[PDB]
Symmetry: C5
Subunit: 307 residues, 5 copies
Amino acid sequence: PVDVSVSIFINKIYGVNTLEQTYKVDGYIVAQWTGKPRKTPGDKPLIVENTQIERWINNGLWVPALEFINVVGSPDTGNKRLMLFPDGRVIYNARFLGSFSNDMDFRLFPFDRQQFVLELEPFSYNNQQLRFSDIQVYTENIDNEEIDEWWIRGKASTHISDIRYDHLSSVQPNQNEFSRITVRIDAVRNPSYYLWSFILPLGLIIAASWSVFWLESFSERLQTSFTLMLTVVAYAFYTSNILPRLPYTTVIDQMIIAGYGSIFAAILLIIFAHHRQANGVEDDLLIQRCRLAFPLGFLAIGCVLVI
Amino acid sequence: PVDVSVSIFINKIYGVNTLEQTYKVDGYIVAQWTGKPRKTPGDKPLIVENTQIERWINNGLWVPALEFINVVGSPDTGNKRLMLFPDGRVIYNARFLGSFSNDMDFRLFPFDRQQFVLELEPFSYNNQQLRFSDIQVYTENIDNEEIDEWWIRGKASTHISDIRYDHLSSVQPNQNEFSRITVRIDAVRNPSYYLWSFILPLGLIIAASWSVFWLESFSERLQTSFTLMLTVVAYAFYTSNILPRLPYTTVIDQMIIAGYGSIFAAILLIIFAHHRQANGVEDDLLIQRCRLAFPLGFLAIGCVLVI
Amino acid sequence: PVDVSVSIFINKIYGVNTLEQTYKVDGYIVAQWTGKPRKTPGDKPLIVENTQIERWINNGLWVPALEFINVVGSPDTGNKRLMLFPDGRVIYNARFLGSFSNDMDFRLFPFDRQQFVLELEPFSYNNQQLRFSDIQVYTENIDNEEIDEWWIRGKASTHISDIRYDHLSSVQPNQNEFSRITVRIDAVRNPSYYLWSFILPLGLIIAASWSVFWLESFSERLQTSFTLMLTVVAYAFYTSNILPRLPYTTVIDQMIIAGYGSIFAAILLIIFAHHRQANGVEDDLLIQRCRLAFPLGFLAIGCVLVI
Amino acid sequence: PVDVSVSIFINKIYGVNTLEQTYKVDGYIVAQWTGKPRKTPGDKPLIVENTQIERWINNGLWVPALEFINVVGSPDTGNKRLMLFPDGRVIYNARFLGSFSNDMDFRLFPFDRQQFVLELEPFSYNNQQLRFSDIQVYTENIDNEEIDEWWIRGKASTHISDIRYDHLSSVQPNQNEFSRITVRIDAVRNPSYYLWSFILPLGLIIAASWSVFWLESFSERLQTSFTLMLTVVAYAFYTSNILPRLPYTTVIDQMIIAGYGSIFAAILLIIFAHHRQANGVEDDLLIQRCRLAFPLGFLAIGCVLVI
Amino acid sequence: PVDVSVSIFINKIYGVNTLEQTYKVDGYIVAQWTGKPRKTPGDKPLIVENTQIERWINNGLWVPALEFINVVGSPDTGNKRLMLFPDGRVIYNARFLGSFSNDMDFRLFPFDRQQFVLELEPFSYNNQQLRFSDIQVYTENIDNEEIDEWWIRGKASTHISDIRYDHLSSVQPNQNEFSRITVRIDAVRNPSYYLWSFILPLGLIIAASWSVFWLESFSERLQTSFTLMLTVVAYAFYTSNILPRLPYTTVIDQMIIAGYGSIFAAILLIIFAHHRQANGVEDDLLIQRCRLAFPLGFLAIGCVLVI
């Protein structure tokens, strides 16, 4: 197996789409191996630009095609360079831009912690023909920098593994294991924007929903509760286009359903308080001192869902 | 007819657009057949990378073009590989990414059950020249996994059929039947997000619309009903962009029209109750005890439309 | 002139954009003509796949370029096939996907009746060099089927005409007439979705706007009218993105302006009724019995605009 | 300098994006010049289709590259044709589709009057090598037709000018002037849709905002004014996505700010009227007869801003 | 090292996306250097159009590939020209259109001041093989012009630097420094649109929120405050799609949170004023004279956040 040494340089990470769970990565890839010796002009290495590698491959040069596994669409490749050394080593440097997809579990959505993953693998050559020696990821541009609301924390984790492909077993009987490289970059979401734009006004609106019990008219209590219900329905509008449709509920979604439940429970309590009239003369004194009990219970529920 | 054995490997299924009834499938296709024997370097099979298959096809190698029938746009093909064996068998391995379209009937929209279908067919060779022997679909990455709100349940169903094309009858008189492969993957939608985000708050709002009959002022009853009508009109806004424009009505659409009907019926009942004054002195006692009759009738209607 | 027989097969019609007046058509085109006799391998016809037609055209084969006239953008062509027969006839089969644009007049917008038109023409050869003999359109997949809200009714109308191009008169003095083929497919919009989602709730809201005259307080009448005005302003929001910006008004637009006029007229009538107080003591008895006159007049106006 | 005669035929103008100030133009371009005589098959002109012009250019034929100056992106070129005449004249006919950008000043936005401009220029040859003789624009399909809300009025104005490029002065010392052709098509926007959809309901809402002074309760006056303020805030929502973000204010924007000013001024007047109580007993008689003075002043202001 | 002189001409800057921090730049690039002397036809320079440079590069001509560093996606290149002079100098003129990304810090968002940056670098040749001599940027079309809300103020700053690349150290031991050119264009945002569309109506609405203390009914005060809370919640809707999700707060965002705080503080003050009843008889006289104290404090806070 030919030993190929890969070096991935990340120019920038951008376009992190949480709705589609994709992210755009731009960078360079440098794959270096050793072949048969050749005579270059002088002792200097020979540089072959893009659309001139085709002539050398037609002449019979072995240049493998290293594809990206977790990419969405054909990765937009830029310029490509081939350095041929007189001692025999061949270096392939290419510029890639790709939309890559990862798992991205959004349980703690504003306080999220994800990893951007690049998977690289030969398309045609198994580990009995091509083997990855080592990889160094030069993530120096985005080392500790803020790509939007994404603190790229730490360095890049590098892994070389072997993947047994089963659909190639019928065409390659006992040799269908491919060498793979995984690059993992740990990122933390910046929660500030959601903290001052989605969590704080919803909390104020839920407190204002608690404020319906300080009125002295049941009909005005219902009208106030319905206006605040309309306000909460006005929310979760521009919340639905900040995260995808997940089976589970996040902090902002729990706060939206908590506001709905608080408003419907306030409506139910005032309806039952007016229903509590035994003979049309009993007023509401014990049942409407929940101005300091309903917010206390809601704060206890919020503490339970937070922790 | 040359017997071609196809193996389709599905890397991921993503981008399931319910509005356009398309879905993006990425994977590999391995078509294997047998031709005339040839002399490769050594006894080892010869691997021909992408843009080097053109030279072999120009020399006269028979490589058929297997197209996708139900694809939307030209399928973005990645790397392609040609394994030539000394015994004579030729293997063509290609990476595809395509937007595929299927029927996708949305009667039970949150509790939906669809199938993703891949149709594969030779473009030029009929069943008297090319015949598909068998297909194995290696759907191991998405075997039991949750692509968004889509439980990929079960394995993949595989079918080989013959399609008689009639527009090719004039150019091919009695031989216009093409071998086709259909791959069907059964998927179930995850109903949780719609259950806690679209069905529960609409149900609470419809209950709050029932709550208008507990007031003691007809004018305030009308004002409350109009505010709740505005709230229901605020709904069906971000419901219209979750499913396409279908001729029939789904569960969420039936609940929206049921809320509209409940609010308009409440308005009609309170208008008729104030109209029920025979001489300006008759109040509303029998006609306004529908606080436990109107919700009961609505629950019966909801049970009828559910089952 | 070489006689070319064209056969167009429509796989599917999809993506009918009413806002841009475009629609995506996928299918196959089979152009058949007769040239000089040639010697193929055996007596069997020779099949030339895609990117192998270039060698035959370089050798000197006459293959015309049939373009689409009413297409938006370069039509995404898939695989192309060239059947060469020993008797001399040449057949060109290509797979196309194109965004085609038509007139699409939207006077009766929910109950609309349009036709999807495909125009095909040689790019370079006039009718003194290439002439279309006949066309058969094999619209069998979408014969009587429901592409979204579009009942494809009937068969396909086929026409061959001659178009005199004037910009080519200076370069071709008396021979600038090009043979053209027009394919017309009649389609009817499915009005059900708009009937239960845009027309019915607007009608209920306009009836609820009539319901303001049953109140017994002028100030509450104004407040109710302003809330219902806000509800109608909440409508025409997700109506503006279902059809383009047309100079004329459709049924839904007439209903929106009719709701605006009904609400403003109700406001004007209640303002004038309170203005009708001659000395501060005259109430409203004759002028506020329009609870059965204003809806009657609005229904008459709706009957006039419907028919 | 070689004299090149250009003829531009416009098939359709569509996709006029006011937000991005671009518009899509599809058509044909016919550039005709005269070179050295050549021997074609017979005395008939020789037609060279697309991807066969490359062989003739490789053999040494002079075919200039005429680019579009004001285009956005690479113009999608379709089929291209080369007519070679035995007398020596060469004709190049190409089909283009391009997104072109123009100035598009939107002062009178619904009653707008713009011009669509196509600029054409050789990429490499200055006026000492290539010179445009004359241009005829055959705008016969869109002569007097309604591309959406765009009355294409009149014919096309044609201009040939010389542009001195300064960045090419260092590489071409005294010869850096390029021949350019400008095509201008005058278009008028159809104001009907905005007239019945954006101007009329806003005017009705502003009249309804004047209608707050006919109430007999200051608190109800404030509540009514705040509801109408909410209605005006509901407007300018789907007005913000019909025109770009311009430094100046258009008619619809002036009407929106006029509605805001009318509502805030009504609030200020009723607040000052209740503040006008000298000792808690003075009512509002002189200050609240502005039901025919405030609308008169607003109509005067609207007449000033209209003319 | 070969000395390359670069001249960049900017045709237009457009499509400045603040949400994605990208901007589209269209222009020409002219790279001029000197090589070995060659014999052209006559003493005149030889012009090589696009897709004819490939033959000269195949013959062995040295044409470097100058890439853009801060570009998003492959830059759409148009026509390319190669001027070969008999004295030996080679000139490469290409037309580029690219989406370029810059930092773009949005602290003072309506009154913003950014710079559009173009970074240019050889892909393969270090400073021991290619060195940039000087660059002149001919920004004459957009010298003092208004690209949308972007006053392009001043001229273009030009810089030539050396960048040490570390991922190329293993393949190039002591020679991994690349010559780079940075072009910086200073631009100022036009604040007018936000001034009359987002800042002025929000300020009027906050003043109207101050106007709740002039009422004489606590229940009506709460209802008015909740309606105005709904109006502020209606704002920040079409504010969220004018700037990206930034960790910090801008002027418009501070005004939105200031309106939320003013409304919640007004609610809290009126609740506490009604709570201030010691024995059910004490009214509100001292605590409700904040009609000229609460606006004064809010104006002081606005002055603090402005400066």
